Amino acid sequence: NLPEHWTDMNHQLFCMVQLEPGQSEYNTIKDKFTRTCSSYAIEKIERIQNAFLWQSYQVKKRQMDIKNDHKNNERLLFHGTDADSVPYVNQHGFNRSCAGKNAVSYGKGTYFAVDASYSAKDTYSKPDSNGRKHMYVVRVLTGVFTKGRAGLVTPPPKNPHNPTDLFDSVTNNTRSPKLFVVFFDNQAYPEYLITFTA
């Protein structure tokens, strides 16, 4: 099911592909980033081609598309991370068990930002020994969501008398969402890695 615009990977399962400025693919990511992070400068943007993460993510997307009633289930969001975590995320994706406590907690899961400026905080995208910061652009299955709460280890039930029928994700604010939290593996696909500097 691998997208036909991916580079041939030669029976390999994983590749990072460096994008070229001037191509729509690079430019649209650069614009979405500079919308809120105009003070930073992009070193490079890599497309993440991970066959196994993509398959598991696309199965979860198909299931959420079946379960929800013609919803836009998927948002393109940002995730800042430290250099030490990039090889793990590239290969294995986002693991809630490794997640940091966010300054404002809406549950114990993986946090994704609407605005690059949030992900660009040194607390999330820690500068490496060479001053480089790292941010993923991520396809996230936000689905149907509600305002979260610090206590959550899964999304809350839509109905308290049906505890197993869950919201797909939670947010800080349902009228103006600026962050989303997901609580399951393969609910987020790391699509691009932005390397950037002051």
Q: CA-CA distance, 82 to 85, in Å (whole number)?
A: 6
Collect all residues with Cβ–Cβ distance below 8 Å to 25 and sequence separation of at least 6. 19, 47
Does position 137 interact with ligand 1O7 (CB under 6 A)? The reply is no
* Window 80-99: residues binding ligand 1O7 (CB under 6 A): 80-81, 99
- From its own copies, ligand 1O7, none, interface partner of 96 (C-beta below 5 to 8 A by class): its own copies
* Per-residue x/- track, 163-192, ligand 1O7 (CB under 6 A): ----------------x-------------
Told to check if 142 binds ligand 1O7 by CB under 6 A, we report: no
Residue 179 contact partner, candidates ligand 1O7, its own copies, none, CB within 5 to 8 A by sort of partner: ligand 1O7
Q: Of the candidates 27, 58, 91, 105, which one interacts with ligand 1O7 according to CB under 6 A? A: 105
When the beta carbons of 34 and 154 are compared against its own copies, the nearer one is 154
Contact, 81 vs 136, CB < 8 A? yes
Using rule CB under 6 A, residue 36 touches ligand 1O7: no
Is the CB of 1 or the CB of 176 nearer to ligand 1O7? 176
Distance in Å, CB of 5 to ligand 1O7, minimum: 24
- Determine the residue with CB nearest ligand 1O7: 111
